[model samples]
Target chain A: IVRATVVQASTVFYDTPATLDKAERLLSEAAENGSQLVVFPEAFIGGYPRGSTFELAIGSRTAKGRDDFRKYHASAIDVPGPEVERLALMAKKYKVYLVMGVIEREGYTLYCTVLFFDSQGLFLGKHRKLMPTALERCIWGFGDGSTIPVFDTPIGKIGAAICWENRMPSLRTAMYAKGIEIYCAPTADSRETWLASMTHIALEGGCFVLSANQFCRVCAGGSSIISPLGIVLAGPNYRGEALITADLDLGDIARAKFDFDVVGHYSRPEVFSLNIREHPRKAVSFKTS
Target chain B: IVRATVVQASTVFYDTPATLDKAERLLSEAAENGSQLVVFPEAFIGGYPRGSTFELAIGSRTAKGRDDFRKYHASAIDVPGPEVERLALMAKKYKVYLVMGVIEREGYTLYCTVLFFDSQGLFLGKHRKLMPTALERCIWGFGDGSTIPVFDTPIGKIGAAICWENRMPSLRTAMYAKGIEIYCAPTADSRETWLASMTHIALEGGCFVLSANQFCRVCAGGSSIISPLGIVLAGPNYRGEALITADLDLGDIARAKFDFDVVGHYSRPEVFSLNIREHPRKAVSFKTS
Candidate 1:
């Protein structure tokens, strides 16, 4: 059995230092409460710009929008930078696995990324958003199959799919195929329908689904954990700024998969198969392969 | 705008004529309500055989189970037989496009198939269940790629995923990739979570979802219609057998697609692709090509 906590709270909005402070407090509190694994909402480090248009255009860029992008970019953290080190230290201090969403700065491009840390202060890995949803395409670059992963950890095998990215069934299939047991979905969508989506993913994939969302300036936060059978273990909590906890029996996943493991027993290999290209794709290829 | 109705009624078990009579009544009622398209539950022609084990074994068949299979086979209707003629005639009489599930008897094989009929009484097409779910595998033959098709109709471009078959994401992707606008899910799984799956598919694929499930004899059911945005428009009315109707603006498909069309605008084909083997695989190998 593993005790997990899902954080549903408002972010400090473009304030990386303040948000990191808040995340640390929440993490310590969850660890104290005996949480073996803790999850935070998508883009928790840098604010999810609810209404920023990104000044997107076919072939034009506005000066005001460029500044907004710069400000947003500045708020993002690097993968192995000081902020991630701080997060790693916190995970080590708390001795709890951490799975948190962040906006990562690589060169000048910003990507929606989920950062994972083991209890030993070790940065395990990261899964970039394979598809930056909707207008998000304007702000963040799309992740490729190379980033679709499930991490083997002490508590359980954990993986994540962010926000509207959950709707992509093949992505979920790929993760399920990878033997993901604890599925994390961090989002900003708190609509009643989102809860339904989370519930469905649990039943479809036979994995324990832990979803975290922000109770933001808008009505967009409701975090919860669902069993392999789609039972709501903790939340869909609209209550602002909360630490939703659940005691999950990992064997429940085994029980659920005994008859149906979407990618295992239930899948028909002869009739259908998903061919995933895990190599990071490029706009231009030169002198290679 | 088109009004579609989902028939959430149980089939008269092991009685073909009675089931036909009940289907006609449901179809006529939905058409009278100005519904241009009507969908019915899976295996509506014959019975769903709720608790049968099929007495399935390795290289051996139980006598009683064989008798049960014979009875079930007798009840199943042949495609071009008088049964299909009656269904087409009913479609013409009601002046509505009919999409209904049936236990199809083609020789000694009984396959779970979805039959489609145009308003003019012409048989448009059919999609056999590609993967017969769980115990269903013991009773039904798997459908091939040739039978996996999206039917073009005046009401909308329609495709279907039957029963537990919705768990297969690749199948759903194929339908969406083919430009499906209206998705029909005819199932026997009446679980509350099944509704969640339908709603997710609607939002994910950017299509109108029409779901029909049997209010089974010893089982459960909650059938309804969901919009492209995952709005529950009609009855998951668990009370009993009934007709659930919703008026859908076809333009909603375009509007939803304007933001994200999973197969069209949102898909990253280079990173991932589904290779569907639509060929018929047989128990015996005839030719190597």
Candidate 2:
């Protein structure tokens, strides 16, 4: 059995250091309670700008919107930078596998990314949201297939899909094909419907689904942990900031797949197949030869 | 606005004609209640073999299982046959766009299929379950893409993905790309998690999701109708036989897509694309040329 906790707490809005402090405090508490795996909500470090228009309109942008974007960019951390290192340190100190949602800054572009850290404090990898929902497109850059990684760990084969990115079925199929046992979904969506996707995914993939969402002024936390049979082990919490915990029996994954494994026995490769392009689309490419 | 009903009732097992009679009775009730579009649960006509194993084990076939299959095969209806004509007559009589599930018999093989009928009493098409879950493979033949169709109707662009076929993101994408509005999901999955998939599909597709599940001795009905914004418009009724009705404002689909439409502006086609072979796979192809 794997003890997992999904953190559903508010981000200290635009204050990366304060948010980091809050995350550490929450992580320490969860570690004390025997959480081997801990997941934080999407954009927990960068702050999800819910209900913010950023003053954007068709063929027009307001000065206020540009200013908002400026501040959001400043708040985002670079991947493998100080903030990521601090999160890794916390995972090491707690001896827990950490899956955190952060806005990663690269030059002027920002990507909604999930960073993974091993209990040994090693930075596993990151998955950027390939597509952002609605107005989120204004602020975040899209992710590509190269970032979709399912890391083989002692606890289980761990992987993640961020926020609305979980809606992409092709993306989910790719992860399932890689044998993702512990699927982490760190999201900003806290709607009553959010739990349904998490549960559906667990049932569909025959994997344990762990989802975490923020409880903030604009966002309502609905973090949940689901079994392969679509059983909600813990949470759908809209109460307040919480540490939703559940002990997952890994054998359940095998038992569930005994009947259905989307990519295994249940797949009809002859009738349908998914093709994912795993290369990064860059604005410019340099030729050395 | 399109008013719809999803029937959650038990099938008259192993009796096709009796089942049709039961369906007509249920359809009449829904139509009388002003439901222009009506949906029935998977295998409502032929029957869903819930607990039967067909008594098959690895490298061994049981005599009892073969006899069970014989009875099941006998109950299944032929697509476009007398049963199809009767169902079309029901649609014409009620003046409702009808979507019903049946065990389709072609030769000796059976398929878990959904038949679509327009208000004109015309048989629109059928979508055979592309992939049956777990033990379902024992009794059902796999469907190819030729049957995956979205029928344009006065109600909306109506289509279906039966049971676990809804779990196949590729299949869902195909339907979405076809601009399906009234997404009917006739399923055998009555688990609490089943509703999640329905709601998630609504939110993700930015289209109305109407699902119907069987309420039987072996099955628990959790049939539901969801809005584009992921709101539960009607029944997830688990209380025996019932008709779940909802009013779907068709504009909601366009409004929901303002921010997110999986196949529209939100999709990253440059990075990911689904390839579906839309042809019938014949076991033995006779070549004259």
Candidate 3:
């Protein structure tokens, strides 16, 4: 039996200690509810450019605009730092597998990221949003081939691709190839139609979809859990926090795979293949340079 | 503005005049609704083996079963005969093109057929269903490679694949390569999910999908018209006979092709190729013969 939960919350920027405290509280509640795994909204930390309206130009002369940009940059967290350590502490205290959205800081560059941690506080690595959506490209960096990996845990093989990244069939196919059973989709788009996109992935990949979205008043908001048969276990809400949970049976996954396993039996590798390219820049290289 | 309508009907085999009368009524309604083209469900002329069910073995029989099989065989129509003439008359009267499903008799063999006619009562050739579904093998003969050809029509380059034939991506690629703009899918599967399958072909081939499914009480009935962007414009109603129509703008087809034209720009023929094999059997006669 696979159990998952969608931990819905308001936008919490990384610059504020209150935001991190709220995240800890939410994670604690998820654990109290017996949620084996919990997921947060896309870039929950750093607040996802909620106020600036994605209009701030890099070369803007306005002092206020420049200050907003500086605040955003300061809020982004560097991996393996204090902020991640706090998240690791929450995971250990709650004893719940955690998947949280964060704005990753690689020197001056920031990326939209989903960091995962086990119940034992072990860092399960992170997956950056491969290609950020239209307006997001102005701030977030693109993820490379190395970040696209399915994490093997005691519960299942968990994989994630954020927001519009779900639209890229190749990315979805890649996760399916890795035998992903629990797929987390941390998105900001709260349109009702977005549920169809998530459910389609659940059905197509035969995996449980636990997706969380922030309830920002100015933007799209809500969260949902999708079953393997493309059924919305819970969802279609806006501007509010709620825990959407579901039990996914792996038996149906095998049945679904029998008909159309995207990786093995159903895939025709000789006819088509997806080649993911490597990144030229790494965080480690920045320090040496 | 380029407008096209897809009619999907669950065709129940009618040995009596009542069913044929219903079929005529459906055709009339399609014409009244400004539909320039109409497609009937698979084997709609006399009916597909609805009572026998999908699991029944047509060849395996008891004494009573043999009599039942013979009755079904007797109901089959001969190509270029009275039944086809009736369809042509209807087409001419309505000034609309028609694609009618029928069980065609050629000598002693019966084949599942789709007969097409122009608005002027001109015959537009026929395509026998290639690779009939499971139990269908008992009653229908396989179509030869010679039967597969896209027909040039005033509306567009039209071609059809019956029922599950849409599952074969190679066959669809072949149709796309031949520049088939209006892809007709005449099927009997009326399940709501089947509509998505029809839409997938439209998206993959960058063509307009005019899929007609039958709405019969005995079967899962819902017909749909899918756009090139994978949008279902009509259908998924499982009740009595209903007509689902849509005005398809060909410009949308052009737009869809621009993004991902699998048969043209998107297709990498150098890396992958589809090789079709033809085996011709020759008979040798002895001196005595």
How much lDDT does each candidate structure score?
Answer: 0.78, 0.76, 0.69
Runs in model 3 deviating more than 4 A are A14-16, A50-68, A218-220, A256-289, B8-29, B43-47, B51-187, B190-210, B218-220, B226-236, B249-289
Which candidate wins on TM-score?
A: 1
Tens-place lDDT digits, model 3, residues A2-69:
67778767764545576888877777777776778787877778776664653455666566766777
lDDT of model 3 at position A241: 67
Q: State the TM-score for model 3.
A: 0.73
Q: Decide which is better by TM-score, 1 or 3.
A: 1
How far residue A49's Cα lies from its native spot in candidate 2, in Å, is 3.9
Q: What would the per-residue lDDT of candidate 2 be over residues A1-289, giving only the tens digit for each residue?
A: 8788877778778778877788767778887876788787777778777677876679587689887778877787887777677766777765778777777788898888778788788987777777776666677787776777868988779888776678777778788889898887776665666666677787778878887777876556677888888777785777877678878888877677776667776667877788888786677889996
Positional deviation of residue B138's Cα in model 1 after best superposition, in angstroms: 2.6
Chain B TM-score by candidate, in order shown: 0.91, 0.93, 0.87
lDDT of 3 by residue, B116-225 (tens): 78879989798876667655667678765556667788778888888866654445555677898888887776454565455556555667777766655566677667
What's every prediction's RMSD, in angstroms?
3.2, 3.2, 6.3
lDDT of 1 by residue, A219-266 (tens): 756677888887887756676677789898878877787666687766
**After TM-score superposition, what is the CA distance of residue A75 in candidate 3 from its true location, in Å?**
2.1
> Residue A46's C-alpha lDDT in candidate 2?
82
Local accuracy of candidate 2 as per-residue lDDT tens digits, B1-289:
8687777788768777776788777777777777787777777778777677876778489688888888878887787777687777777875777777777788898878778777788866777777766666666777676887867876668777776677777777877888888777777766656666677778778778877777767456687778888777665667777777878787777777777667767667777788778776577988896
lDDT score for candidate 2 against the true structure = 0.76
Residue B154 local lDDT, model 2: 67
